[PDB]
């Protein structure tokens, strides 16, 4: 399947993301209002992908239109990018299992992890700025890219594009914050520490939210939700934890404590201390 994400306006961008979500995921029964939900990615076989065509970087103009992202469907990971002008798929080293027919596949030495991309890019995600202008710059960098090893500018471009596509698909919070940059004012979106933490806790969130049954709150590590509107305003798509990212250790997704749904591992991680006097004196 192929989808367009159209950056022309906030309307076209949100519409694009909503259409992708509808096709690839199913709403949770207990976290859904109207057609706005936390949705679980429908099971697909490993190696299944969808393509995302990037459009509308220049508002409503058929230009800057040769960038396609390849997204592994079960986990929304970006496996690489396609220059449709040269018909070339630049594939990250951790996605040799993703095969795209009809293109020249360039298998890269660089892996897709945020650790690697931030290093090569000399750009930290916390505080990263994204604008319409820097998305155009990112596009041009990716269209100029050639070879088997990511450059600094190609890595910066991938950091920006993954944030505004895959991470925004996962998190309605990132969708809402970034989309302001598409308005005629053309402000700058700055990725916050809270945005980053969401992206780092996606798997844990994904394991916990299917257990939600209207508790007054949800706690997953550093992440807290106090009501259903906070959940819906923050999260849009979660993994199908029926995937390696769902489980860290143990087998108990949640504990309900004082009408709050806790990730069990979080509670365990602050209930594993011995008597304080014995701890501090036993040096």
């Amino acid at each position: 399947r192929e989808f367009t994400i159209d950056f022309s306006t906030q309307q076209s961008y949100v519409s694009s993301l909503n259409s992708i979500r509808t096709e690839i995921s199913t709403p949770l029964e207990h976290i859904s209002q109207g057609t706005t939900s936390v949705s679980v990615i429908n099971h697909t076989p490993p190696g299944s992908y969808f393509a995302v065509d990037i459009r509308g970087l220049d508002v409503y103009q058929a230009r800057f239109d040769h960038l396609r992202l390849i997204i592994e469907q079960n986990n929304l990971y970006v496996a690489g990018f396609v220059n449709t002008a040269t018909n070339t798929f630049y594939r990250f080293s951790d996605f040799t299992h993703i095969s795209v027919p009809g293109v020249t596949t360039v298998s890269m030495t660089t892996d897709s992890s945020y650790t690697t991309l931030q290093r090569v890019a000399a750009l930290e995600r916390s505080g990263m700025q994204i604008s319409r202008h820097s998305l155009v710059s990112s596009y041009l960098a990716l269209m100029e890219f050639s070879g088997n090893t990511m450059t600094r500018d190609a890595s910066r471009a991938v950091l920006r594009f993954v944030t505004v596509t895959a991470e925004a698909l996962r998190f309605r919070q990132i969708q809402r914050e970034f989309r302001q940059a598409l308005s005629e004012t053309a402000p700058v979106y700055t990725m916050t520490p809270g945005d980053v933490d969401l992206t780092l806790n996606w798997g844990r969130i994904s394991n916990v939210l299917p257990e939600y049954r209207g508790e007054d709150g949800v706690r997953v590590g550093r992440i807290s939700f106090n009501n259903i509107s906070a959940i819906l305003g923050t999260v849009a798509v979660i993994l199908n934890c029926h995937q390696p990212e769902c489980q860290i250790t143990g087998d108990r997704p949640v504990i309900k404590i004082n009408n709050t749904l806790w990730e069990s591992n979080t509670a365990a991680a602050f209930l594993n201390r011995k008597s304080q006097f014995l701890y501090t004196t036993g040096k």
């Binding site: 309900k256 404590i257 509670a267 209930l271 011995k274 008597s275």
Partner: protein
């Protein structure tokens, strides 16, 4: 003997550095400091505890079960 079995209804740190829990309507205390986090954890996660003692006052044996 199994003095009490059930959920911890409340726990209390005492001025003499002992620790009290109320289980199945009865209060018991322990002087063993490492039982303080163990009991509070059991209370927070909803464990069934079984207070055990020669007579069933103070205790220093307790079993913990997930609910």
């Amino acid at each position: 003997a199994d003095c009490a079995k059930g959920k911890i209804e409340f726990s209390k740190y005492n001025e003499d550095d002992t620790f009290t829990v109320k289980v199945d309507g009865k209060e018991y205390w322990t002087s063993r400091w490492n039982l303080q986090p163990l009991l509070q954890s059991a209370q927070l996660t909803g464990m069934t505890v079984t207070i055990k003692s020669s007579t069933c006052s103070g205790f220093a044996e307790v079993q913990f079960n997930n609910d």
